[PDB]
Design a protein around this ligand. Structure first.
Ligand SMILES: CC(=O)N[C@@H]1[C@@H](O)[C@H](O[C@@H]2O[C@H](CO)[C@@H](O[C@@H]3O[C@H](CO)[C@@H](O[C@@H]4O[C@H](CO)[C@@H](O[C@@H]5O[C@H](CO)[C@@H](O[C@@H]6O[C@H](CO)[C@@H](O[C@@H]7O[C@H](CO)[C@@H](O[C@@H]8O[C@H](CO)[C@@H](O)[C@H](O)[C@H]8NC(C)=O)[C@H](O)[C@H]7NC(C)=O)[C@H](O)[C@H]6NC(C)=O)[C@H](O)[C@H]5NC(C)=O)[C@H](O)[C@H]4NC(C)=O)[C@H](O)[C@H]3NC(C)=O)[C@H](O)[C@H]2NC(C)=O)[C@@H](CO)O[C@H]1O
Ligand SMILES: *[C@@H]1O[C@H](CO[C@@H]2O[C@@H](C)[C@@H](O)[C@@H](O)[C@@H]2O)[C@@H](O[C@@H]2O[C@H](CO)[C@@H](O[C@@H]3O[C@H](CO[C@H]4O[C@H](CO)[C@@H](O)[C@H](O)[C@@H]4O)[C@@H](O)[C@H](O[C@H]4O[C@H](CO)[C@@H](O)[C@H](O)[C@@H]4O)[C@@H]3O)[C@H](O)[C@H]2NC(C)=O)[C@H](O)[C@H]1NC(C)=O
Ligand SMILES: *[C@@H]1O[C@H](CO)[C@@H](O[C@@H]2O[C@H](CO)[C@@H](O[C@@H]3O[C@H](CO)[C@@H](O)[C@H](O)[C@@H]3O)[C@H](O)[C@H]2NC(C)=O)[C@H](O)[C@H]1NC(C)=O
Ligand SMILES: *[C@@H]1O[C@H](CO)[C@@H](O[C@@H]2O[C@H](CO)[C@@H](O)[C@H](O)[C@H]2NC(C)=O)[C@H](O)[C@H]1NC(C)=O
Ligand SMILES: *[C@@H]1O[C@H](CO)[C@@H](O[C@@H]2O[C@H](CO)[C@@H](O)[C@H](O)[C@H]2NC(C)=O)[C@H](O)[C@H]1NC(C)=O
Length: 222
């Protein structure tokens, strides 16, 4: 289990513990998965998505049953295999981001560019620049959100945790159905209960018994 971000990432003066990253509470490194919605024209191939998220094109291709050069229609969700490791008491997967235009902010980078796979709080904690003093060309250390299964999760047969980007209209039930897991395990993974509200544009951990479905668009259809 990890705390649910609960929209605390949308206010960069908020200092809730969850915003600094999942907590290192199990094995210190593991295989994990992110998700990402194809964004045209900058982040819609295995090469560009892997560049942003520091995966590899072959890993993205294999995970989604495409080739390493197959373009991906805008707004399609793809799985992104990554290594998740402990650093400074947190689980994260490291990437690097060079700002493209002055006017980008820790918030726009975390929320828009990285689609809530990181938070402005973790970016600020792990980079030297003041929020009001960022410019094109600055290179940021990006701590992407991932975790490794706890002992309790592992004993239940969960081999991986996947960071899932929630879209408008989904629920813990509909997301669990995509992956063939029970809704209660999704709730447990995020320290939520059956009445908890889950927001769109906020990530949610999904425990997996096996590799995720290769094409999520069809898994997500009713
Ligand atoms: C039958 C049944 O039960 N069905 C169930 C379903 O109902 C259910 O589905 C769920 O249903 C829910 C209920 O409907 C629904 O909940 C709703 O969810 C909504 C979406 O989340 C939510 O809306 C949210 O609400 C939040 C909270 O209010 C809003 O958050 C605010 O957002 C603002 C942006 O829009 C934030 O602001 C920005 O803040 C940042 C700082 O953090 C700031 O950044 C700084 O900017 C300055 C410049 O301006 C920067 O400074 C500059 O820096 C540069 C670079 O250095 C310099 O060059 C420059 O000089 C310098 N300038 C200056 C002047 O200094 C600075 O650097 C930045 N700082 C940093 C660190 O980067 C920005 O400027 C701010 N922007 C603006 C525009 O002001 C604001 O902080 C934030 N507020 C808070 C408090 O966080 C969101 O906007 C809003 N989102 C939307 C889309 O509207 C609703 O409230 C929810 N409602 C309820 C009732 O809960 C669920 O989503 C829904 N789920 C799903 C999946 O559909 C399901 C599921 O449970 O179940 C069914 O069963
Ligand atoms: C941010 O969150 C961190 C994670 O918190 C937990 O995880 C999430 C998912 C939720 O479930 C949340 O409710 C959990 O708390 C949090 O770090 C945690 O902080 C607590 C503080 O209470 C630590 O508890 C202390 O643990 C020791 C034993 O260590 C245990 O944990 C470590 C973690 O790996 C394991 O390695 C060990 O094997 C143990 O399992 C206890 O000795 C101690 O109890 C008290 O004992 C003395 C004597 O009474 C008191 O004087 C002390 O004050 C102690 O309170 C603590 O309870 C917990 O270990 C730690 N976990 C991890 C993984 O780091 C962190 O504090 C949060 N930060 C902020 C700023 O909120
Ligand atoms: C990964 O993607 C490829 C390409 O999209 C999928 O290959 C397609 O799947 C079917 C099932 O194996 C192939 O076999 C044949 O399909 C036809 C469908 O009419 C059927 O007549 C045959 O009996 C046979 O099942 C199909 O040719 C193939 N299409 C292409 C263009 O290669 C593949 O299934 C995907 N794999 C996974 C694990 O998702
Ligand atoms: C990811 O980046 C972090 C820094 O954000 C690196 O953290 C180091 O982790 C090792 C091993 O846990 C420690 O010895 C260092 O002291 C840590 N540094 C900090 C600043 O916390 C981490 O090495 C990076 N991981 C990978 C795999 O590249
Ligand atoms: C956080 O990022 C999301 C995208 O990841 C933003 O959603 C976009 O909002 C703009 C409005 O400026 C729309 O044109 C886009 O269509 C939206 N994208 C999607 C995928 O729906 C969102 O505005 C950002 N900010 C907040 C506070 O959520």
């Amino acid at each position: 289990q990890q705390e649910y971000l609960n929209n605390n990432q949308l206010d960069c003066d908020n200092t809730h513990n969850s915003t600094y990253g999942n907590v290192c509470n199990s094995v210190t490194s593991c295989q994990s998965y992110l998700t990402f919605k194809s964004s045209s024209p900058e982040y819609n191939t295995p090469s560009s998505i892997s560049y942003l998220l520091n995966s590899t094109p072959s890993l993205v291709a294999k995970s989604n049953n495409i080739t390493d050069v197959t373009p991906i229609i805008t707004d399609t969700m793809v799985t992104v295999p990554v290594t998740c490791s402990c650093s400074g008491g947190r689980y994260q997967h490291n990437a690097t981001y060079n700002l493209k235009k002055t006017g980008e902010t820790y918030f726009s980078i975390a929320n828009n560019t990285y689609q809530s796979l990181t938070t402005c709080q973790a970016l600020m904690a792990q980079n030297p620049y003041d929020a009001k003093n960022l410019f094109a060309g600055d290179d940021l250390h990006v701590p992407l959100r991932c975790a490794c299964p706890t002992k309790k999760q592992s004993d239940a047969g969960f081999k991986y945790l996947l960071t899932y980007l929630v879209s408008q209209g989904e629920s813990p039930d509909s997301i669990a159905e995509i992956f063939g897991v029970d809704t209660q395990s999704v709730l447990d993974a995020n320290e939520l209960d059956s009445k908890s509200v889950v927001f769109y544009f906020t990530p949610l951990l999904v425990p997996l018994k096996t590799e995720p479905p290769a094409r999520l668009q069809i898994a997500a259809s009713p």
